[PDB]
């Protein structure tokens, strides 16, 4: 039939139809952009929901692998013993004052990384509050690992507007944020048709590139990047 678009995922069938068993069949292909992940032979009597549910397990497995592959680093606030983890904060980036650190009794509270050669600093609760305010990761930060670096940079000259694929990562249908086009248009303050112009690609007519401030505020509102 036609392709099923689940966020950045495209389930497109082969135009040729086979007759496995006695019933007609089609070879359905699941792509994440240019990379295919599962080619499966499914009947022509299958509805779109059944074709979606056939690939839903591989879709959820790829989502879990993307969450566990681009998870933000974790800073642990510990006491002077350095064993009882008093607090845990997921940070988008580590403090620049971090060096190879083991806690002592010289300072009551210490901040460490969750990595095995732990990097940390002697911190107070006010300074740890300031560092957690400045550097904390947003909840859906792992989608920034599924986006190119040139659409997340904060400088104007080294920034490219995202395509329809990278927009469909976070905005509509089965996007990884989980929001729809109407909700993401409500967060940006634009109309439904104006944002549908942004989401839909194809020809250049009725298709514009999103601006720097709108894309960055959308990633701020969606909890993907720059959202402390």
């Amino acid at each position: 039939m036609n392709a099923i678009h689940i966020g950045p995922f495209s389930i497109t069938p082969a135009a040729r139809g086979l007759h496995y068993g006695g019933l007609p069949h089609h070879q359905w292909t699941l792509y994440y952009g240019p990379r295919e992940m599962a080619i499966k032979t499914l009947p022509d009597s299958y509805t779109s929901s059944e074709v979606r549910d056939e690939f839903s397990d591989i879709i959820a497995e790829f989502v879990i692998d993307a969450r566990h592959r681009y998870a933000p680093d974790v800073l642990e606030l510990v006491n002077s013993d350095g064993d009882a983890v008093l607090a845990r904060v997921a940070v988008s980036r580590l403090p620049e004052a971090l060096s190879g650190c083991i806690p002592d009794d010289r300072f009551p509270y210490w901040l460490l990384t969750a990595s095995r050669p732990r990097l940390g600093l002697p911190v107070t609760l006010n300074e740890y509050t300031a560092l957690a305010v400045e550097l904390s990761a947003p909840p859906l930060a792992w989608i920034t690992g599924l986006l190119p670096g040139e659409v997340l940079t904060h400088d104007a000259e080294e920034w490219r507007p995202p395509t329809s694929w990278e927009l469909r990562h976070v905005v509509g249908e089965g996007s990884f944020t989980g929001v729809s086009g109407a909700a993401a248009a409500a967060l940006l303050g634009m109309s439904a048709t104006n944002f549908r112009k942004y989401t839909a690609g194809d020809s250049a007519a009725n298709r514009q590139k999103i601006s720097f401030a709108a894309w960055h505020y959308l990633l701020d509102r969606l909890g993907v990047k720059r959202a402390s």
Binding site: G100, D104, R118, L121
Partner: protein
Amino acid sequence: ILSTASVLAFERKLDPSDALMSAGAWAQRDASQEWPAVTVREKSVRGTISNRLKTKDRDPAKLDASIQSPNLQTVDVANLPSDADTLKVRFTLRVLGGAGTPSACNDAAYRDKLLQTVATYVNDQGFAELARRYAHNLANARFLWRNRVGAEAVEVRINHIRQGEVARAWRFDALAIGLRDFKADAELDALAELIASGLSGSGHVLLEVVAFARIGDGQEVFPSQELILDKGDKKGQKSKTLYSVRDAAAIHSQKIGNALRTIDTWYPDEDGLGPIAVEPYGSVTSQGKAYRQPKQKLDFYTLLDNWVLRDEAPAVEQQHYVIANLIRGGVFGEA
């Protein structure tokens, strides 16, 4: 802000070679160049049941059925030839230097502070007491562990190799140099000065140490014991194997290194027993009891952190112990 580095890996100094064991007769030691090496051999043992029972094996008939089936093993034994009352053991020791510089480190500020602390220690009291104690551990055959215990006479020769030829020969008498007393001797002071030059980076020191122990004719010598995977049968169970390199029984290099590290007479408990090995938490495996417990704050890690971070320099013997721990190397830091 000077926190301790997460990795503080230290290369070991006083690197020993593997100590090969040969056998021969006393007073032929000056012609001990081509002595036949001690060969590890097999011998079969059957044994009675002799461990402590758990109050249910103490029945008469069941213990009778136990002794009626003796347990069978094939043990590797190392014995001298019957025309040989003297065991020769040869190794080489390399004194490197740069004891305070870690091989791997995380914090460069902590690395620089530790380097300055070690350089300060070298500045007031250089590698003299530790080198004298290591010279004493070379002088007595402590690397002949159970292997000079019942020896009538022990002799140790320590030669200094410079360009493939001998430079300074140190013929000793390990009966006179005790295993408990760290006294002073002119040849021991000369060997201490050589290990001082090696440890301070002044020069390269390679020492060939040969120990001759008079055990007995055809008696049992005690090399390093290996590990058995126990993949065989139960009759020829191979319960004990001894270490060798090429048809020649030998001692492990780390056993020799632990023998040279037994200089620590500054543990907070009573030192009437004698010196223990240089190690964190002063742990001798024969006693099963750790002197320098972290409760008493006399271990290596608390003293090193107090010395470097808080600048609380300990007692002079304790900083001798700390720098000796840095000489022995380790994986200090977070583990």
